[PDB]
Structure 1
Amino acid sequence: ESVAIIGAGLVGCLAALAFSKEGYNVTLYDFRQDPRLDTTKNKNLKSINLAISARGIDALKSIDPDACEHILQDMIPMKGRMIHDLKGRQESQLYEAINSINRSVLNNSLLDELEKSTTELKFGHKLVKIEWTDDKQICHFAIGEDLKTPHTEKYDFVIGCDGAYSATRSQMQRKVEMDFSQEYMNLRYIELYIPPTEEFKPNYGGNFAIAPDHLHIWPRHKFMLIALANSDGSFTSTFFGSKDQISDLITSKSRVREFLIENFPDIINIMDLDDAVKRFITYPKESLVCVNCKPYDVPGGKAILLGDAAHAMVPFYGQGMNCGFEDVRILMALLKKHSGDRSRAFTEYTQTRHKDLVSITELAKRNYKEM
């Protein structure tokens, strides 16, 4: 059986690994170029690192335990949160724990695992149309941003792992009556950077400016800053705030700078303030979108949506990667239970996963709106 998987993000790569392990003929499509190549300048990394949970790790394990051990070997386990107040005082609240994993390492290592299998990788291919039939599904692509060269191929089924703006989802809406909602959040995030120290810190076991084994949080009124360690001693830092508040700041350089100094006085010693200012000013104005569907599948086991394609969530308050990895594990178990009958498996997936998904996404959304 052949399957076309649309989207080579974290979820798409895991799904491709899972299905190739079960002996399927997998073709993995993404319109981006291969991020492993130095000629690829846009890596499409939404964040440098991620918080992976016990569920997320377990999902990876059940699909390929040897690969999981290899892929996660440099993850950094957190023992608690470190709350920084307005005066820069840090309080340690030991853990619901999470570990820091590098996004590009995770994505690229999964791609590497796929190349040890029969999986066919097709970068630079943009899905534009699917023709649904009772047999094979005809997928139409456009190759390249300039030429948009046509490519077509038939598959037994299609897996939509093409993110919040899923082209597969839209194709499926023509075939089945899908309940669907998209909502643009007022939330904006800005990626910041805490460089590694020059000198090795024996108490931290590396060149870290603050404790590498704590999730750092600067909680404030209607906004917050966080920091999560990387392997090289630096921290990936993120500012979360409303688009209006951010717009009201980026009018002048001095306004942003003063804002940072006033609210996060202890980050001055460890972060390049002027670089931080540029990041506020030149940050992508694209809104975060939350989605929900029902159903997740086309009857007859012809297609299924996983990851952000099926349930894009509010960041921080929701855990999209861990949830998406769990999508894959749950799907594969249903396929096992039904001896490969995708029609029953995909149908039961929708029937049992939807209720859990809506619960999770609503909680994440409700919590962000309570700020």
Structure 2
Amino acid sequence: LLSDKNVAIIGGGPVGLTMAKLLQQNGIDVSVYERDNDREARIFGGTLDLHKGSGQEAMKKAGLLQTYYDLALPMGVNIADEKGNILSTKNVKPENRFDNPEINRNDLRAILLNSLENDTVIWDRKLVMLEPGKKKWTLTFENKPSETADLVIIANGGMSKVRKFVTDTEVEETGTFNIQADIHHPEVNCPGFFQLCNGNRLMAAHQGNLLFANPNNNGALHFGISFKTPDEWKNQVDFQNRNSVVDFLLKEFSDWDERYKELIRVTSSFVGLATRIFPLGKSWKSKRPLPITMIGDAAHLMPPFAGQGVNSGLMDALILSDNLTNGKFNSIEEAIENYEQQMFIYGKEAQEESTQNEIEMFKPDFTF
């Protein structure tokens, strides 16, 4: 199918890099175009864990499952209330230690980058436009020379603006909002909350405000505070202004234990982000001018609160890469169609669980 042809993957996130590995290890000529300036760019966010049957199956097929295991950390979960009482402690039993250990996102990028041949990823390449030719796409990048490919795979995340050859679907806001931050040396800077986590991830919910924390993301504490988007914000917190963010959060958390307030007070900077979804519904465009598809969040971005996210994208890469290389399809288009039909099933399943969970967890009286 791909002999004497080449593949362009747009985006070097965990899904795109996994895509590249699974193609390249079957002898496919594939490049990844990534907007990040270079591989040393820090990725902001919590940890990821990979699941048996999906994310771990993609690593296994790439020969990287042990590498993931060696850099990942099994973590228990504590459920606390707003007063700081631990309502539930579930540690990881040894027989479950491979189920879904947490890995830092930069560590995961490094594993995948190290598995690829040199110069597979072309850095500082922000795709802005695609144009189909007779047999090859032309790729236009921001202030860089163009490239061509027989097959384009869109893998550049939930806010991709290069989707229109595949679908007219637009991303949507779901109505919840997320504030995220890191605390370095949390054992010094938020000792009370750090000891509350006690090596476990911690979650707590009270009157429509949700808090989730990881006390040990490669030595830092990552936490997220989520809530229904305030109506006053429709169409007011400047997240560049930590003093404005601290003031808002301290009002929201006014009846939470001081160990939670300390987290807010000592945070150096905050990142805010509306929850969004790229909804799978009616089929994507049929009879596209040249072969093109999408994987990962570009295909099915969904709320993250129940753990859906990267694993459905890693499934995409596993399925699409097998269809493109197993010699069973008469054309790249047919291989793509088969992947998309499968992804519509498990992707819709995951989106409905994520949306249902979001409705439930943000009811004003929810508790874990």
TM class by shorter chain equals 0.7 to 0.9
TM-score (norm. length: structure 2) = 0.79
- The structure 2 residue matched to 1:154, chosen from 148, 152, 163, is 148
State how far apart, in whole Å, the 2-side matches of 1:112 and 1:35 are. 11
Contact (CA 8 Å) 2:78, 2:86: kept in 1 or not? yes
Return the offset for 1:32: 2.0
State how far apart, in whole Å, the 1-side matches of 2:50 and 2:258 are. 29
Q: 1:50 to 1:58 in 2, by over 3 A?
A: closer
Q: Mind listing any 5+ residue stretches in structure 2 that lack a counterpart?
A: 189-193, 238-242, 363-368
Deviations 1:37-93 (A, max 9, x none): xxx5xx3x341422433345423333322x3322441311134x3111132111335
Q: 1:48 to 1:318 in 2, by over 3 A?
A: closer
Equivalent residue runs for 1:52-63 within 5 Å: 52-63=50-61
State how far apart, in whole Å, the 2-side matches of 1:34 and 1:297 are. 36
Deviations 1:217-253 (A, max 9, x none): 1122222111124264543221112331896887585
Equivalent residue runs for 1:60-139 within 5 Å: 60-65=58-63, 67-79=64-76, 81-94=77-90, 98-114=100-116, 117=117, 120-139=120-139
State how far apart, in whole Å, the 2-side matches of 1:59 and 1:212 are. 31
State how far apart, in whole Å, the 1-side matches of 2:127 and 2:58 are. 27
**Does 2:237 correspond to 1:244?**
no
Contact (CA 8 Å) 1:55, 1:322: kept in 2 or not? no
The number of residue pairs the alignment matches comes to 336
Helix, strand or coil for the counterpart of 2:213?
strand
**Does 2:10 correspond to 1:6?**
yes
Q: 1:56 to 1:105 in 2, by over 3 A?
A: farther
Contact (CA 8 Å) 1:298, 1:304: kept in 2 or not? no
User: Which is worse superposed, 126-135 or 219-228?
Assistant: 126-135
**Does 2:19 correspond to 1:15?**
yes
Return the offset for 1:290: 1.1
Q: 1:10 to 1:304 in 2, by over 3 A?
A: same
Return the offset for 1:255: 5.3
Q: 1:98 to 1:287 in 2, by over 3 A?
A: same
Amino acid across the alignment from 1:18: L
**Does 2:155 correspond to 1:164?**
no
Contact (CA 8 Å) 2:178, 2:225: kept in 1 or not? yes
Amino acid across the alignment from 2:79: I
Give 1:228's aligned residue: 214
Equivalent residue runs for 1:1-371 within 5 Å: 1-36=5-40, 40=41, 43=42, 45-65=43-63, 67-79=64-76, 81-94=77-90, 98-114=100-116, 117=117, 120-142=120-142, 148-149=143-144, 151-170=145-164, 172-173=165-166, 178=167, 180-193=169-182, 195-197=185-187, 209-211=195-197, 214-230=200-216, 232-244=218-230, 253-254=246-247, 256-257=249-250, 259-260=252-253, 262-267=255-260, 271-276=262-267, 279=269, 282-284=270-272, 286-293=273-280, 294-295=283-284, 302-339=291-328, 341-370=331-360, 371=362
Give 2:240's aligned residue: none
Return the offset for 1:328: 0.8
**Greater relative contact order (Cα < 8 A, sep 6+):** 2
User: Which is worse superposed, 87-96 or 224-233?
Assistant: 87-96
Helix, strand or coil for the counterpart of 2:163?
helix
Q: Mind listing any 5+ residue stretches in structure 1 that lack a counterpart?
A: 143-147, 199-207
Return the offset for 1:125: 1.5
Return the offset for 1:273: 4.2
Return the offset for 1:185: 2.5
State how far apart, in whole Å, the 1-side matches of 2:47 and 2:134 are. 42
Contact (CA 8 Å) 1:16, 1:119: kept in 2 or not? no
State how far apart, in whole Å, the 1-side matches of 2:287 and 2:195 are. 51
State how far apart, in whole Å, the 1-side matches of 2:321 and 2:198 are. 35
RMSD of the alignment, in Å?
3.1
